[PDB]
Amino acid sequence: GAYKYLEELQRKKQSDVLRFLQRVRVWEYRQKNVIHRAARPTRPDKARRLGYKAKQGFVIYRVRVRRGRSLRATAEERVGRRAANLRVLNSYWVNQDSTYKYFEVILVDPQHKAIRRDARYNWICDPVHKHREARGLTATGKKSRGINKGHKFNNTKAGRRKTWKRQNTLSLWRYRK
Template sequence: NMGAYKYLEELAKKKQSDVMRFLLRVRCWEYRQLNVIHRASRPSRPDKARRLGYKAKQGYVIYRIRVRRGGRKKPVAKGATFGKPGGHGVNQLKYQRSLQATAEERVGRKCGNLRVLNSYWVNQDSTYKYFEVILVDPSHKAIRRDARINWIVNPVHKRREARGLTSATKKNRGHGK
């Protein structure tokens, strides 16, 4: 008893399969040509988006974003690390939030009128990770009238992503695994 979404899920699980490798490669090329943050007309992983709360109706928006991979250098005065003690770690430090959290925050900053609901991985290459972020328009009637999602209209949910309240940002606070 496998519905369409289940099939999609099983396909997406096996990223090394011929189908997925081809798809990811072609899409990766496509995403690289686009702006860093751009609106996607629909989710590229509808099954995943739906599991994370997306509905194909007015008031729901998908943005795709690429984030540069790699660690984070500690800001140092004039970049002068020469002659500093080795213990003053500068270069090999890891940023304590995930790239996914960074992605959510950047999209949230760009779309100030929307609320970040959730996000998921869509692609990566040697330089970038690509995420899709699900946003909700709190001023849209369809959202305000839907009892399942209208909790997000409440002002306490402004900038959830910046305060560690989305799934990805909760993980970075050490909630769950």
């Protein structure tokens, strides 16, 4: 439906329409706290394509971070400490200033019974996903860990400490090679 039009509207970022929305919102988000809850995602098309359903249990925290370790991961880490019961799913850029950057990190309540039911999202309830951001298991964390497929990512594919310990410790068999 509209998500194609919004998808293409969000492309032209410095264009007249979206330029004006930035300068109003950048002022408005400075009035509010560092870490605070938005009731609805400002870029809802982006929220969806990062796994947000507009049902009870999903929370959109807006977060402010300084400019000049990665800022996206710091943004997720800040909301992780404040909203400890929640689990960080994904985050995205909304607006930026000369001094600050804003992200609208999306969260899921594993304790809320609307999530413990449906099988599309009940995986986040499993204790292996406590603080996904504190281990770099989010989108931006996996990006900064250099975890992809290719010749580029040879020395850091399946854990950069794991491949180091494998390469720099002697291995001996019962009947020596």
